[PDB]
Specification:
monomer, mainly alpha, Cytochrome Bc1 Complex, Chain D, domain 2, about 50% helix, globular, binds protoporphyrin IX containing FE
Length: about 80
């Protein structure tokens, strides 16, 4: 289904926020810091399927069971949030 739909079925909208700061960096904000990358949604998918720290803060994102294609839409979904 749509990318956002995935954010709810996996729980991505639980620690993140299209703009408000919660457990992780806002979604749109994430694109503001990585903006300029030649494909940050692809690597974002590799870091979204395994999660990790040294990314935004000392709180490594818990790895999710999102297939590679689902984590790819999850990456472009964050940079496309509102
Ligand atoms: C499957 C749903 C989720 C998606 C699509 C998603 C996506 C992302 C992306 C693209 C990053 C970059 C991390 C990196 O580059 O390694 C990230 C970071 C982060 N996510 Fe998520 N996330 C999801 C669920 C969660 C959940 C459930 C939590 C809270 C338990 C969470 C907490 C964080 C934190 C804290 C960061 C910042 C990186 C750090 O501090 O280590 N995420 N997430």
């Amino acid at each position: 289904e749509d990318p956002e739909v995935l954010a709810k079925n996996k729980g991505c909208m639980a620690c993140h926020a299209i703009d408000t700061k919660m457990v992780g960096p806002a979604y749109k904000d994430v694109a503001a810091k990585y903006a300029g990358q030649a494909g940050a949604e692809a690597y974002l998918a590799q870091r979204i399927k395994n999660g990790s720290q040294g990314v935004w803060g000392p709180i490594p994102m818990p790895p999710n069971a999102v297939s590679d294609d689902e984590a790819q839409t999850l990456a472009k979904w964050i940079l496309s949030q509102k």
